[PDB]
Design a protein around this ligand. Sequence first.
Ligand SMILES: [Zn+2]
Ligand SMILES: [Zn+2]
Lengths: 96, 144, 110, 1009
Amino acid sequence: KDILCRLEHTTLRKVTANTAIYYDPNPQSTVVAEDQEWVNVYYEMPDFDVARISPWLLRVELDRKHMTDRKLTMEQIAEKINAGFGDDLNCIFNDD
Amino acid sequence: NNELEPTPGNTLRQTFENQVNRILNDARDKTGSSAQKSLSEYNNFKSMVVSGAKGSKINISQVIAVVGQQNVEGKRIPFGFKHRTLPHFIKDDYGPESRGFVENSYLAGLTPTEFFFHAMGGREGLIDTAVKTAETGYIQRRLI
Amino acid sequence: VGIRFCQECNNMLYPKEDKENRILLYACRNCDYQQEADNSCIYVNKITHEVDELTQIIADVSQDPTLPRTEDHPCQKCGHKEAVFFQSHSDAMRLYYVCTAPHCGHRWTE
Amino acid sequence: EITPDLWQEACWIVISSYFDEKGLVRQQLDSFDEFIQMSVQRIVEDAPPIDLQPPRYLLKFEQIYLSKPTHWERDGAPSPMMPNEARLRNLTYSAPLYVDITKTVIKEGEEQLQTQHQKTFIGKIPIMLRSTYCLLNGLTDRDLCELNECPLDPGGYFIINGSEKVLIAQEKMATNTVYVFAKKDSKYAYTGECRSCLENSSRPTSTIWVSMLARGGQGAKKSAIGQRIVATLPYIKQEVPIIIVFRALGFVSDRDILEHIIYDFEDPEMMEMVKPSLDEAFVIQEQNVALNFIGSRGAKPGVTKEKRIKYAKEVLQKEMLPHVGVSDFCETKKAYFLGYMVHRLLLAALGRRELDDRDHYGNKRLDLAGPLLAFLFRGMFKNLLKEVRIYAQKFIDRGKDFNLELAIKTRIISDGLKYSLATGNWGDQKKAHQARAGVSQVLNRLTFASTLSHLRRLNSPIKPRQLHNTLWGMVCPAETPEGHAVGLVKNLALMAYISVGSQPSPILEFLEEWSMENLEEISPAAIADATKIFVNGCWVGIHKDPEQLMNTLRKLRRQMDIIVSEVSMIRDIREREIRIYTDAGRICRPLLIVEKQKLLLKKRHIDQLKEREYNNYSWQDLVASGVVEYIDTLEEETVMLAMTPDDLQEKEVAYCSTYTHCEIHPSMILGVCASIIPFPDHNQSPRNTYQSAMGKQAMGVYITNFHVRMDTLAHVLYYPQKPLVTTRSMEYLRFRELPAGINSIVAIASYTGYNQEDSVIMNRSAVDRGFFRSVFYRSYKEQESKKDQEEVFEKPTRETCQGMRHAIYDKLDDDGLIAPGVRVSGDDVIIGKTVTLTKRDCSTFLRTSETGIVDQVMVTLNQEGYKFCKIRVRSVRIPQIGDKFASRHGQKGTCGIQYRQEDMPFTCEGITPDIIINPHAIPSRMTIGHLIECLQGKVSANKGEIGDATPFNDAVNVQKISNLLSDYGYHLRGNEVLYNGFTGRKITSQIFIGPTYYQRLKHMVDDKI
Ligand SMILES: [Zn+2]
Ligand SMILES: [Zn+2]
């Protein structure tokens, strides 16, 4: 199954639950109150909020079947987007 | 009732059809081996099958027992009108007769619905013959 | 999610943030009308479309002669037994229900 | 009151009334009869007056006048013309046409002179034989044979220069609707289409698309905003986007552009979709700018803005959706039905509605001789006007007078309607690789079942080949040609009827007498729950309680008060609409009606049908009393049928209980030549198709006036027999007064071996008694033509005329024609024609060297005044080795060897079968119809009663065919002990004998030697 998953062209459309755009410039007062635990975790000891984060928020949800069907990691999604577009796209992985 | 696990590879739709085309080619053949064996030693169809001079022992298993399934495009009859293959049926008819399968055999005659469905399975194979004379009549006069 | 139309100009209000307030606004172009945005969400882009079909299911499909009427399941609230079911008409072999005996129109799913 | 098990003879009564009244070729006697009734009034009516220019001239026609067909026979004397005279003289069977003309001249000084030309000769229309204008219609049966005509000749073919032509039905796609198809590779995703036109007037089409672009866009042009919608308008070589079009309709604001597109403004799943199309059409607001945007892409792009204000103003009200409105005030109207297409563009782009199949025959309109000649008469009534535009404007310089009776060129109409209806290149003769050829085929005369099923014929315009599900009841599934067109040529069924056409105004003038506020009275927030109401594709009004509007409209077709029987009215439910079709060229069939449990065909009806004489209760009081009902191909999508009223009304385990209709008898779905097959539910369907193409070829007595005719290729049997095993619809196909073959005692045996799997051993001591012995006639055209090298009929002496063979001139008479009763051999001179030069030599030899007898010679004039002659050389043709035979059950065969009564294997009772067919031709060709007809003819020649082989009769199975055979002293499987032919040994096995109806085809062995 490890060999099986290394051949399929898996984009992120296959694992996306849904996608939205908010406008939460303060992370401490986001429209979602549920993520405010772990959004603070990346901002209690924050990294690279140096000059100005753009005040938007692209929130993508992921899946349960299609995310353990291929043993996908929240790091290797976030690391490949960070390697795909540079450090000027502040991508935050969270917990399954 | 959402009580059928989809076999991996296909959806619940394509695994529904493979599940039901399984139960219409076993009864097409459990009515096909018990018909050949039951024919007598003097039976004159058996003299042209055992002797092997005329092959296709499936084409006299439709005389006696069951014509079987019809298909177009490799699928049992698609919904033409609006989810109803003919105006005699209800909607949501995935049943074993409203999509093509034929209980009757040519000796007993055919239901006036099933005469239309065998008119459709005999049209898909009546064209391909008119196509496969402009295909293999062209490979052989080109490969020479 | 839906479109907010422009007041007294009747066009579509683009969303535009206000950096001088750090507060979202809607804005027109052909006039200068704005609006206090109370939504904080531009759009959603649903991939699953796990859609309740029952919004789309019309209670007028109860006087159609070409549907499989049954008496196995009674109504959800009216106690009437003529339940006429059908497909989804759209990955699923789901059957939905519609009660007959009008001024009832209720629908449910098994 | 109700018939339980008397249903079988009941349903064959109500059909007998049907083919009495309508018959088999009324589909060209409704259609062509309606084309000369008003659709040659209407084209003369709507075409605008020539208003040519001080003086001015106005030219306005009036009511038009027909006649009965007439020949102006070259002597300065007129004379009427009858169809058996027009065939023999190569005439064209047509009637003159006469118009009243009003004609005003203006002569400078405020008083004008008007004139009139009463009943001016303008031209001719080829009358279809036997339809209300022919000389035949008006004649009873005995009066019709005092002119050498046939009482069984169906009619529906106009003679053109002597020969017989039939306008085949050229099938097209239905107009005035909204097609949401899908495309595979192109630069779109879910495109729409409409093909608007009104009343079959001028402006033939304007195929406006509305198409959604893909999401495979590059950069931030589309991909960062999403999919957009465009509008491929006609006469614009671009993709003018949507909101620009609505702002050219006099609209401004983006609520009053989305109040014509999306109905509910409270559903975010649709509102997302139109959102990236407002962004592209965003900078234009004023209607002076969008109309500049639209006109800047035209035929020739204008330079000033005042051109591009002028040009696209008539684009968007004259050549874009004409049928919704053609006036200069339909801006508010067009705004909806253009906005309606975008609403059906989104309903398939979202997957919230099924998209339209392309095959489905609810989308198909047929055309018959009526609509096709209307397409050919418009393109030739303008040419009459065009030379009057030319002749008058070349006379404004004089201004002396004006004369129309020298100005109407009558040969415009009387050639193009005769050219394009002769050859088939359907259009004018000046641009030939632009037409739709194959219309107006030439008519068969072989069988009289061919002559029928050559007239009930559709024609696809090129998946059009597989068999679609909407051909239950309309078209025959079995019958189709083989070879280069399988399924592309389809022949009609028996109970199929094609609508003729009607005017839609007395339904719109009924709807407003009940309900239905129009489009001017809708606040379009009150349109999210209404059932939108269509007429002819046009959209007029809405309604709130459609259950009452459904019943009120149904009970006017079932009583024929206001809505005609022709119109069908269709309510879909989930798409929330009502459609009404007053449309010309659909197809529809009659069914019985069910009333909540049971029929409306009650016993008191069919006891009055049974005495059809002296009560005149013949199907025209059974429609009017509301028992039957015409149902088209696309209300069948809304209907519930039962096969049989016996088993499908008795409650069993309640399969379904909401039956609306029932069908008459389910074997009426087979066409003409597929009804002649006994037991066609017992045949493997490659063989019902196979026979339905061999039924055309099998010769027989074709029309009972072949003594008078002068055809080429006239085959006629000596002793045809009506079949012993028959269908109950042979009677209506007229196959007792004109049969097509002889029976034959046939045995299924292997023998000396001359039957190798498609061959047949005959019996020469049965062929001596006239078995299949038939005549083959022949004909010869011979136009004397004086030109100047001219030629005359004469007798050539050998040493005064040039090149000729050793064909001795004994048979020629005093003038150069052979008298009838002179046996001509192979290659001797029959007409001694000489191009005068010493003189050249132009004999016309007997081809094929057949050695027959010259049977009849007629001598007439041509169309012009030149002497003519036709000659009918007849020959018998005894069935030799070679001549090809075939049953009704596929399996065409040859003739191997002809044995003797001496040698053919005799039964216990001195029967020696006429024909032996191979055993091995049964189980792989797979016709078990052939082993039951051969069984049924052995019962029915001892029961003494002509048998029953209707397709789904359910009362004739092979068990009680057997036990009726067993009551005469035979073996009940049909077997019988033959003896040997040569030795007299009893054969170790039995042989299966029985009479079976064989046909002798036209694939003869003496057609090639
Ligand atoms: Zn505005
Ligand atoms: Zn209820």
